[model samples]
Target chain A: SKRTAFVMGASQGIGKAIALKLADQHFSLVINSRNLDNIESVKEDILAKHPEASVIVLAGDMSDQHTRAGIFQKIESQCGRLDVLINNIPGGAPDTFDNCNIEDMTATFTQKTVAYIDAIKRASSLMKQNEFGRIINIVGNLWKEPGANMFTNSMMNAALINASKNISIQLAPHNITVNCLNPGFIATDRYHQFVENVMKKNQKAEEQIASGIPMKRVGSAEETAALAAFLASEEASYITGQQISADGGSMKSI
Target chain B: SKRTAFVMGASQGIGKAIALKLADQHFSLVINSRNLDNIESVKEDILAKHPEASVIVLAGDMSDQHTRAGIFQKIESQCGRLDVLINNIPGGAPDTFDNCNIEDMTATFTQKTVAYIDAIKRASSLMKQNEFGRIINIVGNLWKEPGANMFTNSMMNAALINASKNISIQLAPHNITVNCLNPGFIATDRYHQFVENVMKKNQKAEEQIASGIPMKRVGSAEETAALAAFLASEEASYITGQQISADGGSMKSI
Candidate 1:
């Protein structure tokens, strides 16, 4: 049987890009999101490119426990076992200002922090039973350097990054490598939205923000997806409990 | 009034050394440990060196919530404010191969991880009120490069290191700096025990492990204390949420 993967928030943006990359690598894919229409479009896109790969769309709002359970059940029933689980859920748009209020903080934690843990818990149960599992959490780069209004994003991402490291210790004995991949300011739809919002709010051109990045421009979703593809592969067996930020010298500190 | 600091585990080893360092810096000291006799000796030593500096000893096991409450209450009533909190709690001997069970793990976590958090929580309350706080968690370099049978030490230290970063975010806005100072194989009583254990376990001379370290020999508590002193100074106000391993190139990874 082909290697199977379950990627959360796989309907659009970075998640969709990662799914396509995995499909190209010959992995059977189960892509998840809250919207069926978006997930179906992603499924069609993947199927069109890689006709031999099996693409299953599992759609549900991941923040709700009931929806998360549905996602787990679908994965177990359809895929039987998952070799890799990619938590690609984005908390919100990059460069968004953090209000630091309770609700915003809680939602960010629920989506980026809680959802990843819940997915891992469910995925680990099946993955351990099969004696194989590769958990890769897609965290933001805000923990090292904050852009604009991303206080909550930075906090939530940093917490998950550490939590992933802690979990790696236990999972290492089971040959289940758990790690975090921090995608830098990639040229996803969210990046564009963030730029647009900043442009409108501050009356600055898009070129200004693009020039501010050290790489002179934003990164592509494909670039990030490629790294994720490599990390989930059998070659990355020894690399566990580490957070690798694929930013192009954008982070000033190490 | 002078700047006040609360140093946990300030009985002996690195904790006692750190208390002396703070006293030398002219900060009024509030030191604590599980044993009153050890703490009193440290306090007397501090007073002998810095006659003008004030030192208060709070004797209690910080692992208990009630004890932590008492310690914090004493700080609140006596000092009225605090400028810095140094978490210098030492763990079990590194070469403690026989004690590498669940009980050891729990004990290590309580002293290093849980107690550190409790101290930070209490310190943060006072620091936030004053709009300034410096939290320096003293860790070891073993986590960066784990040797044989040092699994418990590495795991517990890694957890505390990550937790320090997490708390740094929550307390950054209050001007509270949280960072980990990882001492290299320092030439303390703990180092001697580790060397003895390694010599006995591997039937090798003490020179073998010492020669393997990049520095050619073990480090001193004073060297570790110097780095901690710099991190707590006003010059390091901008530096937070970082783990600086002062291992003299002992850690191979970048």
Candidate 2:
């Protein structure tokens, strides 16, 4: 049987791209997001392109406990086992100021850190039973070289990255690997929002903001998904408890 | 004025050693821990060795919010500002695996990750005003490679490492450098306990465990303290958001 994979926050952007990339790898996929319509659109798009691949859509707010439980139950009923779980939820908010409130911080953490943990904790049981699992958390570049005005993300993203490393060590003995991918300024809707915010706040042109990135341009979603796919593969067994940033030399610190 | 440094968990072990090292560097110290007696002893020791260096003991549990507030208030009152904050709190319980529970995990997070955040948050205000600070988190090396039966440390340590990195980026612009020192199997009271546990669990001699480390033995608390001193020095200003493991090459992976 083909390997089974689950992509959280898979309606669009990085998660959707990762789901498509996994489908290309011949892994049957169950994609999830908060919106049923959006997930179905991505699912239909993938199915149209790859007619032979298996695709399922899971739609609900991942932060809700009941919804997370439902996702796992659905997976168990359909697939019986999960080989890979890609946590690509975006935690960035529009505000990038020091005066950002605690509620903003909490919301970002819930979406990025807490939700990721809930999904992993719920998914690990089935993965453990299968005696194989690969978990990937998609984070940001600011944890390495934090940009100004992105406090919530700078704090929470690092927490998630560290959490992945910790979980990796705990689960390694059970043949489960956990790792994080830090995608730097990827060309997604989130990146566009970031650009627009910078343009308005910093009063700089879009080109000027783009120029500051070392790569001279934002990265493609597909490029990041490719790395996630590689990490989720069986060949990446030895690599765990690590955070790899696909930021194209943007982060100054090694 | 002489530089002022606040050492969390500064009663004994690595924290006390670091406090002593800072005193040797001619820094006035504000030492804190859960026990007043232990911190007083550390202060006395520092005063005995470095007669010219000032030392004050602020005894309280760092994991407590009120205690952290008290430390910050004391720093603001006595020193007017802080030039450095050395976060050296013990992460997990000594015999964590023997009594690993949800409460232990929560306490570990409180000590390692949450308290570290509070320290940096409070210290950053003073450091930002002064336009200079060095924050060093003394972490464990368990996250670097596979080890036997250290579930809590492996997870919490990794999270702490990332937390330091995240805080580093935010503080970098304020000229406040934050970094983590991953001490591998250091010979301290904690090391003795770890060895004792291993001997009891594996039915092996202490010498057998010592030989397994790459350096052919365990590291000294002084050695770990030396690295902390360097990172906390003005020389390490440009080096922020990094995890340097002083494991005597015991850590197998990069």
Worst 10 residues of 2 chain A by lDDT: A94-103
RMSD (CA, Å), each prediction: 6.6, 4.4
TM-score of each: 0.66, 0.79
Model 1 DockQ, alpha carbons vs. true complex: 0.07
Candidate 2's docking class is incorrect
Report the C-alpha lDDT of model 2 over B160-251, residue by residue, as the tens digit. Answer: 66556656767788999988888887878887887776676563566786676777777887888999999888878899988898787877
- lDDT tens string, model 2, A56-144? 88898887667888889999999989989998777757444345543465466566676787677767788889889999988777665
- In terms of docking quality, model 1 is incorrect
Runs in model 2 deviating more than 4 A are: A20-28, A43-55, A92-110, A128-134, A142-180, A201-204, A212-216, A226-254, B21-27, B44-54, B93-107, B128-132, B143-179, B202-204, B227-246, B252-254
The sequence of per-residue lDDT tens digits that candidate 1 reaches over residues B1-254 is 37788888888777777888989889889999888998999988888888787999899987676788898999999999989998876765443322343345445556555667667877888988888888898877655555346555664565466556667877788898999999887777877877776576563565787687787777777788888888888778899989897776688787
The models' CA-based lDDT, in order, is: 0.76, 0.77
